[PDB]
């Protein structure tokens, strides 16, 4: 693996075979393992794509890693899924692992589908970030976000360096899914890709004013 | 890419505590943590975003060999790799591979020769 | 004893990969591996066969103390033992215990004295 080092607020990747007497490393406290969000990059972060970013396969052990720090989350994800018969789709979250502690938004989801045997991985090979742990696999009833990892030194300078939704699956993207946000058991919404959390909080509240089964609208990074 | 870095870390610094360390006179759930913010001095954070997307490959491959689930020793191992690069078991103070500063030694040596 | 060494290892070298590292666009089961063969140059492999049968004793005893199941830190620990033998916290560059090569320093020193 590489390694990057802060120095005068400019980063420097230290190629392995290369030698730098100039470096300094006085403690592990200077070292950090940091987990990053895929929200600072401007990717799609909606429930549909979140289905599309993943797949299944078996014959693969589970693989887990630990991180110290990260970045606050705009959005998050959680699942509770079975098959058509009503049989589970996923593994069980072991001990220790916990929901990602920070979530300005939560795209919690339920439903079922075929769920072919395997585990919920990422297309591009990203990670699945939990309370101070990340991995390549989903576990039921748990918060997380998609992300990557960094590895750093810091110098001895003086800097020190909520919401819930609901949905239902529909067959898990077999070229095919209808998504439906839930307000109650007699209310749902045809979900639509380009619509925000905030848009649909407004939607919740305005129908929550207006007496409450399915409806429609009948018709860009957030740091701005 | 975002320049902004509304980030966090864990409250595991040094002098930040009275006696709140006691296990169940402490949160353990949401009050063990630390926040922070920065801004993209010198394209730095977009640089490391690039860096991490480049890291993922060699990461998973370096990972894949073992059978172990919950890895914790990688960071040590990286540090030991650093030192073995620095310190394989033999040093050449002149051969610019060992990274020592003996140059000023000649100061006391010339102080002795003028004795 | 066999001289022949039809052996194997794991494909966890460095530059051997394009993008096949991706978890489930990769085997993880039988295609993560490496093979190889050698022949008994200098009685070497029968030597290490003897070596391992001799190792087993101290291995299990060094093991037995802990309660831990799946050991992974032994090899590090061996390396740190090596370095502490090399580096206990104090060095005697002359006292042939610290293993440095400063002898050629005298080259520049005599270059200075002839100044």
């Amino acid at each position, epitope marked *: 693996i*590489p*390694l*990057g080092v802060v120095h005068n607020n400019t980063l420097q*990747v*230290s*190629d392995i075979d290369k030698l730098v007497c100039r470096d300094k490393l006085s403690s592990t406290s200077q070292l950090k393992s940091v987990g990053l969000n895929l929200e600072g990059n401007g990717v799609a972060t909606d429930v549909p794509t979140a289905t599309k970013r993943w797949g299944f396969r078996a014959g693969v052990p589970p693989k887990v890693v630990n991180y110290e720090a990260g970045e606050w989350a705009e959005n998050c994800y959680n699942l509770d899924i079975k098959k058509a018969d009503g049989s589970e789709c996923l593994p069980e979250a072991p001990e220790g692992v916990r929901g990602f502690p920070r979530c300005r938004y939560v795209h919690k989801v339920s439903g079922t589908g075929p769920c072919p045997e395997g585990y919920a991985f990422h297309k591009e090979g990203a990670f699945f970030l939990y309370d101070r742990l990340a991995s390549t696999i989903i576990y039921r009833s748990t918060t997380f976000s998609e992300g990557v990892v960094a590895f750093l030194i810091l110098p001895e300078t003086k800097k020190d360096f909520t919401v819930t939704l609901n949905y239902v699956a529909d067959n898990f993207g077999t070229n095919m899914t209808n998504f439906l946000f839930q307000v109650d058991h007699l209310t749902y919404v045809q979900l639509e890709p380009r619509f925000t959390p905030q848009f649909l909080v407004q939607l919740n509240e305005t129908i929550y004013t207006n007496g409450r089964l399915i409806w429609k609208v009948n018709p860009w990074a957030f740091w701005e | 890419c975002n320049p902004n870095l509304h980030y966090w870390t864990t409250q595991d610094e040094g002098a930040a505590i009275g006696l709140a360390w006691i296990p169940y006179f402490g949160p353990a759930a949401e009050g063990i943590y630390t926040e922070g913010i920065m801004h993209n001095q010198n394209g730095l954070i977009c*640089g490391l*975003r*690039q*860096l991490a*997307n*480049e890291t*993922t*490959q*060699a990461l998973q491959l370096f990972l894949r060999a073992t059978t172990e689930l919950r890895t914790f020793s990688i960071l040590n191992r990286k540090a030991i790799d650093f030192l073995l690069q620095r310190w394989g078991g033999t040093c050449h103070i002149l051969g610019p591979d060992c990274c020592i500063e003996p140059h000023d030694w000649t100061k006391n040596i010339t102080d002795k020769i003028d004795q | 004893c066999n001289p022949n060494l039809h052996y194997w290892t794991t494909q966890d070298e460095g*530059a*051997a*990969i*394009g*993008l*096949a590292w991706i978890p489930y*666009f990769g085997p993880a089961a039988e295609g993560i591996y490496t093979e190889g063969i050698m022949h008994n140059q200098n009685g070497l492999i029968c030597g290490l066969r003897q070596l391992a049968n001799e190792t087993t004793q101290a291995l299990q005893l060094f093991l037995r103390a802990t309660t831990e199941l799946r050991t992974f830190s032994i090899l590090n620990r061996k390396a740190i033992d090596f370095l502490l033998q090399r580096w206990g916290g104090t060095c005697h560059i002359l006292g042939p215990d610290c293993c440095i090569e400063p002898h050629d320093w005298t080259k520049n020193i005599t270059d200075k004295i002839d100044q």
Partner: antibody
Amino acid sequence: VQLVQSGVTLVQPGGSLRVSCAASGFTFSSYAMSWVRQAPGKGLEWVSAISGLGGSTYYADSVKGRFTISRDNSKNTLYLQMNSLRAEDTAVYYCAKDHRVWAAGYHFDYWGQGALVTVS
Amino acid sequence: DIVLTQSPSTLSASVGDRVTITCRASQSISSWLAWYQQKPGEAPKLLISDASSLESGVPSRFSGSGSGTEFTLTISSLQPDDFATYYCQQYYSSPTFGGGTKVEIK
């Protein structure tokens, strides 16, 4: 988006050389680079490549240990020092970039000019 | 380790015709193949990523496809410029090449 082959030369066997390939008109640090061989009289093969910032490097097996990839993202310039030469080393050597962003990729976009490096 | 297999090594044709190429290898790949072209002493160009995604500047006359080990290419209509050399490019594990393919008339 312009690429620059610089240092084609005939050098005796066992020689050594540093090619440099420059670039322009794009975010060079935000891309990968590589070196690729065309032996005349036959086809292609991949040699070696780099991360976006000089951390990670990659080589082919045939010349592993011989050659030394190198880059200057300050100049946005590519480099390749090269050790002892042989016959198969007689070939063109291009500098190119990948289609993916942040140097995490393959399946090159474009090419340069190529330098029929040779021995005698 | 893995070795492509262009099939055939050259063609003879005539403009406007529709032409197909097949490319194979030893082990399976997940539609992570790419195609290229160059001429007798010209620097190549990208054509397709993943054997299905053409690129800017590419004429739509071409058509790539395939899966696993076998992979393909088809040209709807020919052109004089399209009579150059084309190549199959693994990038799965050992981002290698094979021989290549060529066009003629007689």
